[PDB]
Amino acid sequence: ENLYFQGSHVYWDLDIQTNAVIKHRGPSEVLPPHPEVELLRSQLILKLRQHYRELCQQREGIEPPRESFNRWMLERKVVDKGSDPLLPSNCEPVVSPSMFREIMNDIPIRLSRIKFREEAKRLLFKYAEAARRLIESRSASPDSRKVVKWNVEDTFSWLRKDHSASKEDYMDRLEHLRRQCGPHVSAAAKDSVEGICSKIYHISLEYVKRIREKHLAILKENNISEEVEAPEVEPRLVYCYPVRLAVSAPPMPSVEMHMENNVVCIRYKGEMVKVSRNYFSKLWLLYRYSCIDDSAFERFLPRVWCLLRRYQMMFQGSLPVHVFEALHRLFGVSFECFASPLNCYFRQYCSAFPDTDGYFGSRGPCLDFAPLSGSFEANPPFCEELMDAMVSHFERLLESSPEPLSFIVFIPEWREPPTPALTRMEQSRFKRHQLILPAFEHEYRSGSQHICKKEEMHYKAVHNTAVLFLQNDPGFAKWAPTPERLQELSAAYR
Ligand SMILES: Nc1ncnc2c1ncn2[C@@H]1O[C@H](CSCC[C@H](N)C(=O)O)[C@@H](O)[C@H]1O
């Protein structure tokens, strides 16, 4: 009963070797990270977030929906053909469907939960006033104007007369009025919201070039060229390896590091990133297991600074440790399709950034990773466009491979009407079993687990979680969801 230090718990098993198999692929075209480039990349995101909250206020009088910007970057990266690993650069369509609908949901007014009878009367009144105002101001068909005008006016006549209404009466009147005016207000504000989604995209596209022009200037300063070395590959099937970068890495600037109360602090030009001690030791193991261009491991500290700085600009949680042990012991799981160097359980995984995370075991973005065999676990971030692309990606891999392939996907029943991605997997021909983790009866690890305290690690899931076993025929023959296996799996959730 004597820990090495306070918080010296292990939340990973970096000894599990991979069973993921891929065709040997060439290096990624993304440039190796550099602290001077990430410093410019971080301050351009902070400007981009400020542009986003100025456009929503100046053009709609509303603040941006919470996490709508972060969700926007996930959606953009599903279709982005650009070369920046964080900001979108070449997307189709320009207007993001994710950012568009999240803004529309708070138009003409962001509805808030009401805790009193007069609060409901206020929200109903404020909505009616905002809906009528938005139609008169923005160009619309005289028909659409008249429908909103009268339907709003009817709500006002009822508010003056019927003073005996209750908290429930005001709520039902709002939903009806929201149903009637909803479609008409959307067409009037469509051009305005599309402008917000388009302006933010074009500003980011401009920021990407400002990042590349400084990144190329640093490479040319160190006499490094952006050319191919030897794309001649002997085509073969191999076990998965960390994503490699084509361009050689230049020598990194010096960074200063100190530890205070088992918390590691790394500094570069006044900017400091923090990480707890055991996760700092974890990154050291991942760096030794994965990095092959740093012979003396001399770029470790500056590359860790870039890693932590990248996930700071990025601003769910992980499965419990005892659950990952069960997935590996019962279903041979050895790979996380959605993870990061800070939350990964295995030393092989897919992450959002191949330039900063490849040095720590990442295989790059999941949609660019095409395994032909292996047992996988999938806990993707809540983003419908990414989730939908995921099951399409998984189904293609299960279709076109005679080797054992398995995907155990954890998706919450968060939304009152389920995401199409969850429904698509429920009807998949590779679905071998569907399991439901009851709400308030299973846990997750913190999303800030890399620096949060041990008392703040685990939290109860307030929603159900759907666990789906997507396996081809040979994968089902090897890692079948047998009753005895499903028995021990649910035993780890207790
Ligand atoms: N395009 C992408 N490909 C792979 N992983 C991605 C990704 N975009 C985001 N992610 C990562 O997916 C993670 C989802 S949280 C998952 C936690 C844990 N690895 C688990 O499986 O339970 C986030 O940390 C995020 O960084």
Question: Which residues lie across from 378 on neighbouring strands?
Answer: 409
Q: Is 83 exposed, middle or buried (0-12, 13-18, 19+ CB in 10 A)?
A: middle
**With the CA atoms of 342, 345, 347 and 349 taken in that order, what torsion angle do they form, in degrees rounded to the nearest 10?**
-80
Q: Pocket of ligand 1, candidates 340, 342, 445: which has the most ligand atoms within 8 Å of its Cβ, to mutate?
A: 340
Return the residue matching tokens 């959307």. Answer: 186
Helical (H) or strand (E) element with 94:
none
Count of residues making up the chain = 494
Could you tell me the distance, in angstroms and rounded to a whole number, from the CA of residue 140 to the centre of ligand 1?
Answer: 43
- Are the CB atoms for 408 and 374 separated by under 8 Å? no
Pairing of strands 458-460, 443-445: antiparallel
How many CB atoms lie under 10 A from the CB of residue 65? Answer: 17
350 C-beta closer than 6 A to ligand 1? yes
Question: Which residues lie across from 252 on neighbouring strands?
Answer: none
Q: How far is CA 323 from CA 12, 409, 429, 444, in A?
A: 11, 13, 26, 10
For residue 284, what are its two tokens? 């050291």
* Resolution to one decimal, Å: 2.9
Return the residue matching tokens 């599903």. Answer: 78
- Are the CB atoms for 422 and 491 separated by under 8 Å? no
Could you tell me the distance, in angstroms and rounded to a whole number, from the CA of residue 338 to the centre of ligand 1?
Answer: 3
Could you tell me the distance, in angstroms and rounded to a whole number, from the CA of residue 381 to the centre of ligand 1?
Answer: 6
How many CB atoms lie under 10 A from the CB of residue 293? Answer: 11
Which structural technique was applied? X-ray
For residue 228, what are its two tokens? 């191919």
Q: How far is CA 358 from CA 49, 299, 303, 331, 368, in A?
A: 27, 14, 11, 26, 13
Atom 13 in ligand 1: residue holding the nearest Cα: 339
Rounded to whole angstroms, how far apart are CA atoms 39 and 455?
32
Backbone discontinuities in the chain, residue before each (C to N > 2.5 A): 315
Pairing of strands 256-259, 458-460: unpaired
Question: Which residues lie across from 377 on neighbouring strands?
Answer: 336, 408
Q: How far is CA 142 from CA 9, 138, 151, 189, in A?
A: 66, 11, 14, 15
Rounded to whole angstroms, how far apart are CA atoms 139 and 156?
24
Instruction: Specify binding-site residues for S-adenosyl-L-methionine.
Output: 379-382, 440-442
Residue 13 contacts by C-beta under 8 Å, 6 or more apart in sequence? 324, 325, 328, 345, 346
Rounded to whole angstroms, how far apart are CA atoms 73 and 217?
26
- Are the CB atoms for 321 and 11 separated by under 8 Å? yes
